[PDB]
């Protein structure tokens, strides 16, 4: 009986572990599907601070393009002059919030900053996980042979 | 009630003048004062008008000190002194009937009288039927017939005189001198000058002599 | 008393010697009634153009804006505790609302809050004072920078520095003209006066040399300087009306352009008769320096 | 002949008649200086205006607000293309760099272009031209609308015109002024020599009842005329350059405050020579008509 | 050598002043007209000066007819004939000496032959001194001898008065008479004119007769 017995509790053993082993590709799975969920929040979050540039851009042209006015041809034009200098601190305004927009961002880049190192660290992570499914790789070549004796 | 003790003037550059004259207190009768004219005499008959003040001594004709007068009360003065002078002048473009009578507006009379009186007093003078000719265009010495009437239209108490009938019609004299006893016969005292000795000779003169700017002598009833 | 004989023989004296010649007497009224106009002409121009006084001033307006948490109340009390100042004229307060269409309005960019939460832009207010000048200003600034609720103060001090020496540039120019104006027209009237009462001098000399008055020789000049005048006024009175209304011809164009009317109305009958007034009297007192001259030279000394 | 011995007979004559009497006879030739003053002024002031010429142009600038991308030397390009083709006076060029410059001298619009990566901010040309009219300048406008290398032309056309129609205000108000101030000083210059030749009517009469030349009668009242039109003339140069060293002390702050130097040149000596024979030659003309009224009502009729 | 041929000047409103007169006149002789001054006298003398033309009739005076002739000649002819008015006129503040020598002046002419012939005047007008004095503040009279002597400076072929005595001493007259006759001895025609009978036999001369703007007749020293 040393052939059968010895050769199909062995099997058993791998079955049982076999049975971890998927549970871990079950946890490997979702372990990789909130990666990319990650990911993804990674790139759409990426994509914001675009905006950032654009309306920067807009405003600054907007800026240069009525900023240059003589006082003489606004007080002659019924332009009331008494704006476009509250206006400039209108503009001081909006860019400081912009700037507090900026803030925003900048907690957006600084997020992505410890949303990078510690997802390199699950990166690490995975690299550690590959490893321990390549030592838990052999369970089938084993069971290959000691299927013959079975 | 002329009178003079010591006076005195002097020209700041002109000449030196006339000095220390005197004479006494009349009233309404002929006195002449002439004497020789050789010199400017008109400076008497200024200083009697108050036009002059005098250089020194003191004098008064009305009880007043002609030296210490005020310009306020000056014209109240030369109100009622009929004066004639000789280089006469006249208001030109001015009718003679408004240019002769003109001390009676000053003096304040009702309109109606004021025509009869000056028709009285031009009539008195041998001019007539010209009281509407300007004094230009008018024959002279018919004009100076004018100025002397302009200071016997009214009634003054005195009555001045530097030159008449100087180079005049001796003939046409004798109507202004009865002119003048005439209104010697109210009452006014007359200070007529002239030149001529033989005319001064008569109307029972009273007169004095002046040279070089004082009395010479007394000449009375010459 | 009777005296009024002498008044009935000035005035109608007067009439007659004014009524001789015309037009001697023309060029002599129609020469002082523009020396006259001058200055009464630019007087008018000033007055009418002091009516839009408003825009001249409320330009350097200092803003207040106050911080971002603040009660609409706390808003109304401040407004009102800022009008009690004596240095200012006006006050207001711009909401968050208007400050947004405000700015849309001039910047032409349009949409502005694309990607941001909430509102940033805090509630203004706005003060005017009095006169505009580099001290005053900043004084009134300091005074304002310790208000209960106030963060900043801006105020563009290079822009308020011109406007102090763009408003004093134009006082001393209508100083300096109105001045020369003036001396022209005393100069002018003194002159003529002076010369056509030299004209007679025979008449004072014997008029003095009889027993006559300060008075009665006086008064025919006095009537004389009088109807000078007087016809002086009338003959300005009735051009500078002619010149302020070819004037207007050209002044409502621009404001139409503007979108508002400002013609020019001018001559007003009660400076009309002022203005004559004033030329009856500068005429009669010019009468009587000049008689005074003459009679002051024939003193007796 | 005997011609230089009367001429300086006249010549003596009028001297002793004008510095016979002192205190007077200045008073005349002070009123008409000072009048010469207001109508030889103003034309100083015109003529120191038009030399500023700058401030009449440069005040509507079409702003030809270039594209974004476009390399330097194709923009210099377009620079001399533009200084070359007329209606223009100068085109210039800046740079995104100096544009940079000029957007972060204010305080606003700061602290925030160093995190965006580069400029976004485009190159752009001033372009001043001669005309100020609403349809030239339109047409100029759309004339350079098609460009390779434009994205838009930025002016205001409500400020195209308005600003047409006040320079208009001023140069009926200037052509006014001007008639009114030459109608005034020519009638006081004739006025005056009237008033003072009348009261020598007496020299005439006697000279021509005696066998008199007709430039005899003349001679005297045309060097009595000259005289006064000389003293005249210098009176006015002297209050001429002094009331312009007067106002030049403040137009010379303003020209200070903004980046320049200008200020107000006082007389030239040309102009100064110029303004003393301008005066005296109303006399030989003020004389020549005041005495031509005595010289034809004594004519045979 | 003046002509009248039917001459009569008419006022536009005022009156008749002369009607068609005319007379002969030759060169070296006298002319004593008589008339009077408000009956057109005047008039007739300031005819012929040629500052009012006739209104009727032709004119004659050297040649030339005074109807119809420039204004730029006149001075040409009066410059050559001396003329004295009844009324002086005289150059205010002007010295006597100056004022004496207008028609030389006039003439043009070195300054010493002007002081001379200046100082031979007076001699014949009798006036020594004063030569300096102002033609005001002076007497009487002495404005009618320097009025005189204005139109004896010089030697006019022709010479007008109207008349210059009949208001003096007759004493006094003959100086006047005396010059005139003197002027008139060198060759100078002399027209002088008054309406005093008296002077009509004092000397021979061809009078003449004016009355109510006509002329009766012309009788020799009537």
């Given amino acids: ?150 | 009630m002329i009178r003079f003790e010591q006076v005195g003037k002097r020209y700041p550059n002109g000449h030196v003048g006339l000095h220390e004259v005197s004479f006494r207190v009349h009233r309404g009768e002929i006195l002449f004062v002439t004497g020789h004219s050789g010199a400017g005499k008109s400076t008497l008959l200024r200083l009697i008008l108050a036009m002059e003040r005098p250089t020194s001594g003191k004098l008064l004709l009305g009880g007043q000190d002609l030296g210490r007068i005020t310009t306020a009360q000056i014209p109240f003065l030369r109100r009622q002194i009929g004066v004639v002078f000789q280089n006469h002048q006249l208001l030109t473009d001015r009718t003679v009937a408004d240019n002769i009578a003109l001390p009676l507006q000053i003096l304040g009379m009702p309109k109606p009288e004021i025509a009869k009186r000056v028709a009285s007093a031009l009539e008195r003078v041998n001019l007539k039927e010209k009281g509407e000719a300007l004094p230009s265009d008018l024959s002279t010495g018919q004009q100076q017939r004018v100025g002397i009437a302009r200071a016997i239209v009214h009634q003054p108490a005195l009555l001045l005189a530097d030159e008449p009938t100087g180079n005049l019609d001796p003939r046409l004299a004798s109507e202004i001198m009865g002119v003048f006893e005439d209104i010697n016969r109210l009452g006014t005292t007359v200070l007529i000058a002239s030149h001529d000795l033989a005319l001064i000779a008569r109307m029972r003169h009273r007169m004095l002599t002046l040279q070089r700017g004082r009395i010479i002598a007394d000449r009375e009833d010459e | 008393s009777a005296y009024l004989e002498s008044h009935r023989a000035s005035l109608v004296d007067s009439l007659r010697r004014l009524f001789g010649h015309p037009f001697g007497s023309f060029f002599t009224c129609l020469v002082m009634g523009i020396t006259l106009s001058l200055p009464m002409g630019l007087s008018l121009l000033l007055n009418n153009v002091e009516r839009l006084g408003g825009s001249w001033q409320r330009a350097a307006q200092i803003s207040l804006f106050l911080d971002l948490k603040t009660s609409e109340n706390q808003g109304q009390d401040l407004r009102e505790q800022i009008e009690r100042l004596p240095d200012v004229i006006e006050a207001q307060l711009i909401s968050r609302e208007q400050a947004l269409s405000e700015l849309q309005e001039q910047s032409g960019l349009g949409e502005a809050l694309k990607e941001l939460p909430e509102n940033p832009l805090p509630p203004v207010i706005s003060v005017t004072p009095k006169q505009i000048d580099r001290a005053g200003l900043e004084a009134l600034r300091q005074q304002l920078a310790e208000l209960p609720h106030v963060q900043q103060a801006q105020l563009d001090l290079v822009w308020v520095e011109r406007l102090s020496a763009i408003l004093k540039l134009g006082e001393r120019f209508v100083f300096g003209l109105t001045i020369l104006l003036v001396l022209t027209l005393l100069l002018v009237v003194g002159n003529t006066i002076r010369l056509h009462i030299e004209n007679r001098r025979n008449e004072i000399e014997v008029i003095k040399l009889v027993g006559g008055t300060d008075g009665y020789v006086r008064r025919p000049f006095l009537y004389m300087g009088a109807l000078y005048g007087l016809g002086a006024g009338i003959l300005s009175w009735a051009l500078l009306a002619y010149s302020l209304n070819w004037l207007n011809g050209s002044v409502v164009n621009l404001s139409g352009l503007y979108g508002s009317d400002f013609g020019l109305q001018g001559v007003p009958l009660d400076d009309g008769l002022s203005l004559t007034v004033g030329a009856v009297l500068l005429g009669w007192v010019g009468a009587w320096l000049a008689v005074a001259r003459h009679l002051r030279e024939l003193a007796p000394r």
């Fill in chain 1, 1 to 150: 009986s040393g052939v059968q017995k010895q050769l199909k509790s062995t099997e058993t053993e791998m079955g049982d572990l076999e049975k971890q082993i998927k549970a871990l590709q079950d946890e490997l799975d979702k372990s990789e599907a909130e990666l990319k969920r990650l990911d993804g929040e990674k790139k759409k979050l990426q994509d914001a601070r675009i905006e950032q540039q654009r309306l920067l851009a807009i405003q600054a042209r907007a800026a240069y393009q009525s900023g240059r006015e003589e006082y003489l041809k606004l007080l002659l034009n019924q332009e009331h002059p008494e704006k476009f200098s509250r206006t400039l601190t209108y503009y001081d305004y909006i860019n400081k919030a912009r700037l507090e927009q900026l803030a925003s961002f900048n907690e957006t880049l600084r997020q992505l900053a410890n949303v990078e190192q510690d997802i390199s660290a699950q990166k690490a992570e995975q690299l550690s996980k590959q490893g321990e499914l390549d030592s838990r790789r052999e369970a089938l070549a084993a069971t290959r042979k000691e299927r013959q004796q079975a």
